[PDB]
């Protein structure tokens, strides 16, 4: 039960402001370098 | 305030390149240990339907690598979901569901799960859940049947467990 989240639970937190924070620039750099960075983000 | 995950998870991206070796095609992207940090990453990466052919996404915990050579996988095996008659978003949704099952720790034998891999190929796409012990039938079977539930797989979609190791 502890540290267990259902699909509904996890989805709810998707709209959390902390879930809205964009990746750091280093990570973003790595994502663009791999070309896996989502377009128009 | 962030909600902690049971495990640290690491995203890996494989880009198929004839020049480099199987292991060297794999690229470690980032690690996270909270629900919020997961969504941050997931919202800002291309879905599986949009990545190059021959490429993989993989998510693994305990700093385990998506490689045969890793000790955590050597005695392990995997449930393999071959996707036939699946849409691009069916793929994206099924992959996302697998991710949520893993980071959510939805399995009773969550200790046995090492990670999940999605392979993007033209002939056939595959999503696999890697297990730590191939000989632990009860753990595999529980993970298998719950996976079939959480993913709500159709009859056309096949689910088969297999050992990583090549053995007679």
What would you say this structure looks like, in words?
The complex is a heterodimer of chains A (41) and B (168). Chain A has 41 residues and is mainly α. Chain A has one domain. The radius of gyration of chain A is 14 Å and the shape is elongated. The N and C termini of chain A lie far apart (36 Å). Chain B is an alpha+beta fold and 168 residues long. Chain B has a single domain, classed as 2-Layer Sandwich (RNA Cap, Translation Initiation Factor Eif4e). Chain B contains four helices and seven strands, in the order ββαβαβαββαβ. Chain B has a seven-stranded antiparallel beta sheet with strand order 2-1-3-5-6-4-7. The longest helix of chain B is centred in the middle third of the chain and has 16 residues. Chain B is globular, with a radius of gyration of 15 Å. The relative contact order of chain B is 0.19. At the A-B interface, α1, α2 and α3 of A face β1, β2, α1 and α3 of B. Chain B: Keywords: Cytoplasm, Initiation factor, Nucleus, Phosphoprotein, Protein biosynthesis, RNA-binding, Translation regulation. Chain B: Its main location: cytoplasm.
The appropriate CATH architecture of chain B is 2-Layer Sandwich
| CATH top-level class of chain B | Alpha Beta
Distance between the termini of chain B: 52 Å
Please state the structural category of chain A.
mainly alpha
Strand content of chain A: under 5%
List SSEs of chain B in N-to-C order.
EEHEHEHEEHE
How many structural domains of chain B? 1
Euclidean distance between termini CA atoms of chain A: 36 Å
Q: Summarize the amount of helix of chain A as a percent range.
A: 40-55%
What's the helix count of chain A?
A: 3
The helix/strand class of chain B is: alpha+beta
The tally of beta strands of chain A, per DSSP, is 0
Protein name (chain B): Eukaryotic translation initiation factor 4E1
Binding site for mRNA (chain B): 22-23, 68-69, 121-126
GO molecular function (chain B): eukaryotic initiation factor 4G binding; RNA 7-methylguanosine cap binding; RNA cap binding; translation initiation factor activity
Family (chain B): Belongs to the eukaryotic initiation factor 4E family.
């Amino acid at each position: 039960m502890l540290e267990r989240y259902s699909k509904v639970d996890l989805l709810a937190l998707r709209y959390s402001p902390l879930s809205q924070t964009p990746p750091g620039i280093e990570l973003e750099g790595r994502l663009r370098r791999m070309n896996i960075w989502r377009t128009g983000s | 305030m962030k909600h902690p995950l049971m495990n640290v998870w690491t995203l890996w991206y494989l880009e198929n390149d004839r020049s480099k070796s199987w292991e060297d095609m794999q690229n470690e992207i980032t690690s996270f240990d909270t629900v919020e940090d997961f969504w941050s990453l997931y919202n800002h990466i291309k879905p599986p339907s949009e990545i190059k052919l021959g490429s993989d996404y993989s998510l693994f915990k305990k700093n385990i690598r998506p490689m045969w050579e890793d000790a955590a996988n050597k005695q392990g095996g995997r449930w393999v979901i071959t996707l036939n008659k699946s849409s691009k978003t069916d793929l994206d949704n099924l992959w996302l569901d697998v991710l949520l099952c893993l980071i959510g720790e939805a399995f009773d034998h969550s200790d046995q799960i090492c990670g999940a891999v999605i392979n993007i190929r033209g002939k056939s796409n595959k999503i696999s859940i890697w297990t730590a012990d191939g000989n632990n039938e009860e753990a595999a079977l529980e993970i298998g049947h719950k996976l079939r539930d959480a993913l709500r797989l159709g009859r056309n979609n096949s689910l088969q467990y297999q050992l990583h190791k090549d053995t007679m």
